[PDB]
Amino acid sequence: GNNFEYTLEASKSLRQKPGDSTMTYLNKGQFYPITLKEVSSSSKVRSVIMVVFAEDKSREDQLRHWKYWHSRQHTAKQRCIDIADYKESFNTISNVEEIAYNAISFTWDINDEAKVFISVNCLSTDFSSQVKGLPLNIQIDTYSYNNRSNKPVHRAYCQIKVFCDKGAEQKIRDEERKQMDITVFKPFIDLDTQPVLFIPDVHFA
Numbered sequence: 001g002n003n004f005e006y007t008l009e010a011s012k013s014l015r016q017k018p019g020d021s022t023m024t025y026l027n028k029g030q031f032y033p034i035t036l037k038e039v040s041s042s043s044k045v046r047s048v049i050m051v052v053f054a055e056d057k058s059r060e061d062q063l064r065h066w067k068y069w070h071s072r073q074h075t076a077k078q079r080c081i082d083i084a085d086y087k088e089s090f091n092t093i094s095n096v097e098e099i100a101y102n103a104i105s106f107t108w109d110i111n112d113e114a115k116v117f118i119s120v121n122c123l124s125t126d127f128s129s130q131v132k133g134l135p136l137n138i139q140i141d142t143y144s145y146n147n148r149s150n151k152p153v154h155r156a157y158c159q160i161k162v163f164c165d166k167g168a169e170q171k172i173r174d175e176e177r178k179q180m181d182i183t184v185f186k187p188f189i190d191l192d193t194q195p196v197l198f199i200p201d202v203h204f205a
Contacts, residue, residue: 001040004154006140006185009033011172023161024183025168031084031117038110045110046143050103051081051120052195054135054159059196065127066198084117100197120162136160140185156185
């Protein structure tokens with residue numbers, strides 16, 4: 001069927017007032033457990049895990065920003081999103097492909113629960129010198145095997161804020177002084193909007 005659910009297992013901020021949106025806090029470069037599942041009342045598929053700008057701009061602008069981040073990295077080989085090599089994960093997915101520095105593709109069977117371990121390696125402030133920074137999401141697009149449509153058949157996202165040096169846990173401790181285990185991905189039905197993939201190129205330098 002088309003009944004998918006994804007989770008991210010990390011610390012989630014608390015809602016101060018009605019209308020406040022909820023953020024999931026991550027440490028930079030640290031692997032978090034993500035689950036993907038097809039829970040229908042009744043077969044292989046392909047999912048793409050992305051880190052994308054939440055703000056939703058022109059493509060030129062999103063490219064501009066990835067370029068700033070990539071230039072500030074200490075290694076040209078440093079990616080925006082990574083996936084771990086756990087046999088736990090190996091046993092549930094296959095055909096892993098790093099299609100871009102901010103995207104990772106893989107296939108899985110819907111009769112299983114796919115288990116991956118994912119890290120995000122960019123701070124929200126890495127896109128400008130000296131501010132609140134840029135909102136980030138983890139997005140997941142899921143395609144059928146056939147892909148006759150060529151579009152996702154299902155899409156969802158999770159708002160995140162990324163920290164350095166175990167700063168994630170410190171921030172929720174802070175929000176407790178002033179005063180659950182799992183974040184579920186928010187689905188959406190715009191299947192046309194393709195997200196920008198950052199593929200660093202070194203031609204013509």
